[PDB]
From TrEMBL, chain A:
It comes from Escherichia coli DEC2D. The lineage of its organism: Bacteria, Pseudomonadati, Pseudomonadota, Gammaproteobacteria, Enterobacterales. Belongs to the bacterial ribosomal protein bL32 family. GO terms for cellular component: large ribosomal subunit. This is Large ribosomal subunit protein bL32. PANTHER family: 50S RIBOSOMAL PROTEIN L32, LARGE RIBOSOMAL SUBUNIT PROTEIN BL32.
Amino acid sequence: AVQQNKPTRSKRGMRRSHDALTAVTSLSVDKTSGEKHLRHHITADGYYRGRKVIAK
Amino acid sequence: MIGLVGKKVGMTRIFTEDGVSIPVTVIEVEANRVTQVKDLANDGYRAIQVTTGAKKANRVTKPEAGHFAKAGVEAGRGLWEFRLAEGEEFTVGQSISVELFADVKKVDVTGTSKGKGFAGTVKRWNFRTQDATHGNSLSHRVPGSIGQNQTPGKVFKGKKMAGQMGNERVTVQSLDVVRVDAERNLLLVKGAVPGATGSDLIVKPAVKA
Amino acid sequence: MKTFTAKPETVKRDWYVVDATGKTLGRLATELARRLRGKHKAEYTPHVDTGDYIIVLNADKVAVTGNKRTDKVYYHHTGHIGGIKQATFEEMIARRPERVIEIAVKGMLPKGPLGRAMFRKLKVYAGNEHNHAAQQPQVLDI
RNA sequence: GCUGAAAGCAUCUAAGCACGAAACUUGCCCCGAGAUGAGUUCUCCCUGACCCUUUAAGGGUCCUGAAGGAACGUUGAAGAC
RNA sequence: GAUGUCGGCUCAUCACAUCCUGGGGCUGAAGUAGGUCCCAAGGGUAUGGCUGUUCGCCAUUUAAAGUGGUACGCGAGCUGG
RNA sequence: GUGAAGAGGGAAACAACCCAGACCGCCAGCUAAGGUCCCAAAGUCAUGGUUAAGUGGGAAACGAUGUGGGAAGGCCCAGAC
RNA sequence: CCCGGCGAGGGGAGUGAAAAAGAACCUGAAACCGUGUACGUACAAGCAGUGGGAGCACGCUUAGGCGUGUGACUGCGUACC
């Protein structure tokens, strides 16, 4: 139920070796708007694949 | 002898004139094309590598295309190897049809069993369920004891516990060959075979005999 | 001054070929272990592998005295509950003859990372032919 | 059990030879090259130009970015992730 | 300055002084069926009535309902008679 | 007598057994118990025998033409077994 | 003055001998948690050291074979009260 010995800082780091986050490989660029966005996601200005989806 | 690669179409029944219903699994065995022949001199053993079906040309990788191109055959959905019993001769590009099973009368069917995911001991190992009442506390389907006291202060290897069940290679032996339809590339075998509909199956003549 | 110590980057290792036909298993193994460790070299250093590469031919024809050919038993445990498996000397020779010499030498070598490295210099072959002619092994009448 | 001396005989044993069980090794099914002893076979891809120096399995710039992989998306009789 | 117990339940694992199945010698072994000893641990090896019981008696099965070790296996797995 | 209050070497590991009593330093030598084929420092040492059982490296009453050595005895080319 | 939400918190500027005295304010230790650099580390088993010891990095200083850091491999070695 509980530990018999205090795990080391080395053991703590070893467990956290798989906790590293992964950054997005790259961001797509809208063909017309030209702004960066997540692939398959609309841009911040409401564009997607150069179609100007609803932006209100 | 060598076997063939087919697809599990499904299950149906065959009504005999004597009033007997035979449960049959329909296996679609298209022509198997020999992509490579391995011999003792070069590979150290005798076998034939075959392919079946069709694959999108756009999705065939260049390393795979070159392998098919050398044999001069169209790409299939995969590659499988069959050992040769010291009396079989095959040539690259040869097509093997379901007629090979014409006079076999009994086959061994291998496939990937349906995946049950993370299964408990009751389902996976047929463990007996404990009492549903009479004071039982949160221990209705739990495994129970998993070892002995200090003397073997450890759990033995191979202990039956919960874990992945199914989705593994399984062979069912000695299945009667109900029908061999060369025209429709169909093979009917009495009984059920591993895997879901549309999965690949490896059919070989029965080894037990 | 300080006592000489061999450097692993400058130690010279030679290649030898030994015919095991008719040789007593144990008395052949001791010499192999001695030469694999480098005890026969004046530059011997306990923490350095100063031994020589040795090729053993005709391992299947090694000899054993007494009734050991049918009475010597090789035990090993697979790690499972049953686990315990055994094979006689004749069975080992028939199945994998090279393991007979390899097992004998391994026990006589030191235990640890270095001893494991020394064992890597031993090449045991069941037949009378080896494919190490490029190394120009020298016949060793051991 | 056979043949057969030590022991003129006898003797399944000492030399030699033949049978003999759900045990043993195989045969059947599954995993399996992290088997660091890391194996084999087939196929596919890459055929630039310079600089520095403690000059070597060295470092750096420009050009180049293949096979393939991953990522993302639609998803599955695959799946806790 | 704490190594929680009888029995039940769940899950077992080993030994062989073998209960069944397998191979044998002897028999006061005609056969069928037994007795005794040797080899053999691969697999298999009851459900119920009474009682907290283990055990035991009883009812009815089975090829057989083996004997022991494992903190009289197993309560950070259940139960609490 | 030793441990207790005693290290070192040996007995695989092993306070009490065997050898032996650590003031400090040395990359010098000789020995004790115990050892000298490899792990692992030193004899694959020399000479003459024994064992075939891995005895050596676990054990009794008792059983047996195993095998070595020694001192006698009975019957024997009037022919022994 | 600038970033920020007319924030929090910072970077400049300025005051001061000092702002690494900025009000969470003299000095600012240890546990504990980080960034950078050198070396070691993914076939190796245990009080983590000790004796031996290669390689690498760095410093030398009138090649001087030295110091410092690291520690592959190896003998011995089961904390303290």
